[model samples]
Target: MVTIDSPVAGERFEAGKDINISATVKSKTPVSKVEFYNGDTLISSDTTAPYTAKITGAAVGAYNLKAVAVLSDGRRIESPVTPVLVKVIVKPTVKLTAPKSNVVAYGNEFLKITATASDSDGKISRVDFLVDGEVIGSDREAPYEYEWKAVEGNHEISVIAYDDDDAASTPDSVKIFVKQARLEHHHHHH
Candidate 1:
């Protein structure tokens, strides 16, 4: 069997906190070295065991931490998975500005909705749109808006906004109905 173990599975901790990972490393020959990576960046190395490493004062959000073992025969094995998270505190938020509470419309070729967002300590990154628990699309930057081809009957439009920390604001939504567009006709009398 292939041999390499990183941090334990489902292991999570917060930022500005301490996390310790230790694993038993067995190799055919005496393992030469061990190394750790924090999101593709090597942070520490040790040649001695209990094969443990500690992350102190990490940032918020998810991280990919890995540990590798090198053998005397010039063979090395890396951890199978990446991305171990170190979450900080909660981030900023988002709120809608348009359709002005309950809105009514006839026919739907194009529909736009607006929102205003701010952060307690950061900037808004992106917004996601959902309908009936299914994602429709997404947008970035300020003035979060969406365009959709309407179907008959009432439709639920929902939005989720997020910040750089991966923290998200609660979803905002509006229900609207679409009808057939009216066709204008002209008649000439003799």
Candidate 2:
């Protein structure tokens, strides 16, 4: 019988990372080769002891692994299926370019909401803009920007970036205080 030592059942890893699978075979007959399988589909094979298989850039999903050894005597040994999961742990990131200062005084309430988004292994799908926790608008491509009309007083402006896989980044929030335009009086006695 063969036993899988690495990537034990229920192991978890991040997507796009390398994974190592190894197995041990105990037998009197010299083992000829060891083959690793992912649900009956051969992925890698080794003819030397300390048999191992390597998976480069593992995609995000579940994997059922098995190791089979062929003895020089035309005999074979098998190991039970081992399971593992790969998930996306790194969220997309975004940076705000407009509204450089926390406080601003826009005469016409013209606020340019802009940001740059990026992902570790995928392209950014879109960026969502929010004001006071409400989704106000979205940009679907690079050089993300939104034309916003700001209201007087204090408000929280936020933006979140989503990757092609719909994985969202932590919303980047900024507190902004727009000064009310009180430049002129209605009837200044002329």
Candidate 3:
């Protein structure tokens, strides 16, 4: 069985970047070689194990990437198609501004989390606000924000900005400590 192990279906690669494709080849004996292709056009081939290929300067377009393996028994096996969306994708950038690192908030307060987002290649589609790695809300406009009820303990607040090409950027995150409400003490003198 030959399978395209990298660049899963519907994966996006940025422009001017190499499109790397890896393959898995299985056979009873030593296989001759493994070939990678974009549709019918051959890109590259590897004779050794750890079969891999790279395509460069490909025009922005969708490509159906597949791998073919030549078995020792002379049987040719083709991998399932891995569809790739190649385009001018500059992932949107974001920074978590509010509730900075190591900040504290009481349980009675409504914590207002905010982030600043921007897309260099296109307008931002949305900024996903994640709490402890779970998405709690999203904002489509500038000054993206989310109002979350303060939860006690340490929390990881992160945001992901999505560009018009639907490419998501690396998470911009900050860790915050939410504290429980401090009970008040009153002293009476008789």
Candidate 4:
């Protein structure tokens, strides 16, 4: 008989973290070797007692694990299959699309602000647009964009994107120097 230990059924694991898998074998005759498998792929085989192996670099997904025990007489025993779940955490990225220039001359006029958000393992939930450290608008869909009135002097625009897993990304910002429009007075002499 073969019994698999360590990872239990429906257990969750984080990607990049090493998982220890172990098994035990019981037989009247001496055991030759024990093999561990992740689904149909063979992982490792140990000839010593207390068979153990480490699993690493598994992608984010569901996995099935089992152990096979081979006796010295060539008889084999397989353990029950175990289920596992893996989750990968990747930070979302936010890019400023509009207001590419560092300086602007549109004085007191509505300016279009745009940003793009993307995640490797999850979907973006929302993006918050901020101007001068204040939130101006939020967009939940792709092609996130907002309109804000421009003011004279130095201004900064930033965007923060959130994913469905409640993971937030670093805010991406752009600076704009708005030059105020000056009016010239004309004098007429008769």
- Candidate 3 ranges with C-alpha deviation above 4 Å: 93-107, 114-126, 130-145, 149-160, 164-190
Return the TM-score for each candidate structure: 0.56, 0.51, 0.62, 0.50
Model 1 earns a TM-score of 0.56
Writing each residue's lDDT as its tens digit, candidate 1 over 1-190 gives: 1222545554555678876655456666887777766767777777886677777887777766677887778888776555566755465666766664355445645667666767676678888877655777778876677776655566777778887666788887777665555532354769
lDDT-based ranking, best first?
2, 3, 4, 1
lDDT score of model 3? 0.85
lDDT score for residue 54 of model 1: 76
* lDDT tens digits, residue span 64-108, model 3: 999999877788898988999878766778888988886657765
Better of 1 and 4 by lDDT: 4
Stretches of candidate 4 off by over 4 Å are 1-86, 181-190
Name the candidate that leads on TM-score.
3
Best by lDDT: 2
Backbone clash pairs for candidate 4 read none
Model 1: pairs clashing at backbone N, Cα or C within 3 Å: 63-84, 64-83
lDDT (0-100) at residue 8 of candidate 3?
88
Better of 1 and 2 by TM-score: 1
Clashes of 4: 0
Cα-based RMSD of the predictions, in order?
8.0, 10.8, 6.8, 10.8
